[PDB]
């Protein structure tokens, strides 16, 4: 905990010049159109534009800790809005271009955005989610569950159980939820494209999951302002704000980014909505 390896923190930011950025997001659109099974991998960088600091960016929680300074929050977790990137990921699932979403984020924003939980792995937990120790029943709360490290919250299971409810936030020693990890691993293996958005990919095994896509000839795109552990393994590395990348990508795919109706939980993915016909690529 005190000595925990917090990794490479505060590496320099890289900015692809506009022409190169325009060319790479078009190439990404090409890869999404070619791909049968697209898995997205999200970390703290997709929530920075809603006021939540990341961990290893220049003003990251861990980076600021290393320099004797404090990260800064411009929102509560409760008053945080899903970013353009969050809402672009909801649409891609709706139109059938996203098979599965793997996230390391505990900020609750994917769930709250209306993203279906049966297509989401929350590898590090969710600040709004408590779980019954007895029956494993999960509750998605409108406020952050007051505890972290799989501690008793003080509330009891209401299943037609009085089981102890505990937070889902892993501490350093806690291994990943077996259900979320199994499903993240299956989706990543079966993907022919994994796209990473705002994760430095430094945490095992979360950070390694995109590499599993490379097995049997999958393609790996890394979208990140900083270098990431697996940059060498990527067919495409885009250095720019994930919101700029996802808004240009949606525009290329002929999709609107949907409006956020406020906090809404969706347990189960609906049948695919209609989407634009595919371009002639070759």
Ligand X SMILES: Nc1ncnc2c1ncn2[C@@H]1O[C@H](COP(=O)(O)OP(=O)(O)OC[C@H]2O[C@H](O)[C@H](O)[C@@H]2O)[C@@H](O)[C@H]1O
Ligand Y SMILES: CC(=O)Nc1ccsc1C(=O)O
Angle 242-253/18-34 helices, nearest 10 degrees? 50
Minimum Å gap between C-beta 134 and Zn ion is: 4
The number of residues making up the chain comes to 282
Q: Can residue 101 be called a binding residue for ligand X (CB under 6 A)?
A: no
Minimum CB distance to ligand Y smaller for 44 or for 212: 44
Query: Does 224 participate in binding ligand X (rule CB under 6 A)?
Result: yes
Applying CB under 5 A, does 132 fall inside the site for Zn ion? yes
45: partner contacted, choices Zn ion, Cl ion, ligand X, none (Cβ within 5-8 A by kind): ligand X
Cβ distance 156 to 164 under 8 Å?
Answer: yes
CA distance 90 to 120: 11
The catalytic residue among 124, 230, 239, 252 is: 124
Closer CB to Cl ion, 90 or 169, in the complex: 169
Binding site residues, ligand Y, CB under 6 A: 44, 52-53, 61, 71, 106-107, 127
Cis bond leading into 176, ω under 30°?
Answer: no
Nearest-5° angle of CA 230, CA 96, CA 122?
A: 50
Enumerate residues 25-44 that contact ligand X by CB under 6 A.
Answer: 43-44
Contacts with ligand X, 171-210, as mask; x by CB under 6 A: ---------------------------xxx-xx-------
Please answer whether residues 29 and 21 qualify as being in contact, where contact means their C-beta atoms are separated by less than 8 angstroms.
Answer: no
Q: For residue 125, what are the CA distances in angstroms to 106, 140, 202? A: 5, 12, 17
Q: List binding-site positions for Zn(2+).
A: 132, 135, 157, 161
Active site amino acids: 124
């Amino acid at each position: 905990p005190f000595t925990a390896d917090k990794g490479k923190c505060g590496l320099p930011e890289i900015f692809d010049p506009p022409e190169e950025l325009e060319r790479k997001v078009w190439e990404l659109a090409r890869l999404v159109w070619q791909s049968s099974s697209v898995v997205f991998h999200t970390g703290a960088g997709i929530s920075t534009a809603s006021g939540i600091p990341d961990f290893r960016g220049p003003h990251g929680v861990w980076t600021m800790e290393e320099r004797g300074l404090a990260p800064k929050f411009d929102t509560t977790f409760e008053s945080a809005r899903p970013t353009q990137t969050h809402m672009a990921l909801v649409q891609l699932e709706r139109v059938g271009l996203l098979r599965f979403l793997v996230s390391q984020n505990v900020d609750g924003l994917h769930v709250r955005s209306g993203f279906p939980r049966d297509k989401l792995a929350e590898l590090h937990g969710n600040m709004f989610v408590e779980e019954c120790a007895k029956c494993k029943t999960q509750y998605v709360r409108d406020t952050v569950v007051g505890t972290m490290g799989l501690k008793a919250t003080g509330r009891l299971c209401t299943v037609a159980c009085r089981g102890e409810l505990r937070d889902t936030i892993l501490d350093w020693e806690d291994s990943l939820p077996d259900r979320d990890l199994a499903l993240a691993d299956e989706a990543s293996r079966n993907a022919d494209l994994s796209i990473t958005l705002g994760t430095s990919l430094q945490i095992r095994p979360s950070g390694n999951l995109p590499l599993a896509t490379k097995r049997r000839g999958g393609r790996l795109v890394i979208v990140n302002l900083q270098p990431t552990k697996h940059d060498r393994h990527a067919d495409l590395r885009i250095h720019g704000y994930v919101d700029e990348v996802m808004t240009r990508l949606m525009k290329h795919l002929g999709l609107e980014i949907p409006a956020w109706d406020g906090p809404r939980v969706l347990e189960r993915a609906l049948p695919p909505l209609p989407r634009p016909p595919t371009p002639k690529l070759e």
